[PDB]
Amino acid sequence: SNAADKEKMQIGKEAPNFVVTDLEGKKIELKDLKGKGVFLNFWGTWCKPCEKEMPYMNELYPKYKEKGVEIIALDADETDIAVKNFVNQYGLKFPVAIDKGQKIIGTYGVGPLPTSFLIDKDGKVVEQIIGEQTKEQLEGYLKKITP
């Protein structure tokens, strides 16, 4: 079997590492991002609260990226075509990746979408956030994990 079968997300403890390819073909490994805050967002193109908040994230991203915060938007296993088209129409600049198999979703215990996790520079999960957030709200979270 695999040890990751029994990996577990705990508030105030190290995030379950994962490895995905983003839509620009680039490798993301969560552990590689130690030194940065990470806003880990689980989403979908059909989820209206996800759709409405993602422009907000997009307007916040340049601001917080320089400050060493990464946004990783994990899509809930839709097609490459459905997702590339969504990202395209919105002009998203932050990393987007499809969680093939919904594996990472399972590891993270995600049900309702959208769900976000705040991961700080140590790679510790500090907060789990459920439901659509406002731009003001999102910026708050992003400040909370600025390195």
UniProtKB/Swiss-Prot annotation:
Q: Annotated Gene Ontology MF terms?
A: antioxidant activity; disulfide oxidoreductase activity
The alphabetical list of record keywords is:
Cell membrane, Cytochrome c-type biogenesis, Disulfide bond, Membrane, Oxidoreductase, Redox-active center, Signal-anchor, Transmembrane, Transmembrane helix
Show where the Thioredoxin domain sits.
9-147
What does the protein in this record do? Answer: Thiol-disulfide oxidoreductase which is required in disulfide reduction during c-type cytochrome synthesis. May accept reducing equivalents from CcdA, leading to breakage of disulfide bonds in apocytochrome c; following this reduction heme can be covalently attached.
- Disulfide pairs here are 47-50
| Cellular component GO terms, alphabetical | plasma membrane
| Transmembrane helix recorded as keyword | yes
Q: What is this protein called?
A: Thiol-disulfide oxidoreductase ResA
Q: Name the principal localization, coarsely classed.
A: membrane
From which residue to which, out of the full length, is covered? 30 to 173 of 173
Q: How does it sit in the membrane?
A: Single-pass type II membrane protein
List where in the cell it is found.
Cell membrane
- Describe the family membership recorded for this protein in Swiss-Prot or TrEMBL: Belongs to the thioredoxin family. ResA subfamily.
Read off the lineage from the record.
Bacteria, Bacillati, Bacillota, Bacilli, Bacillales
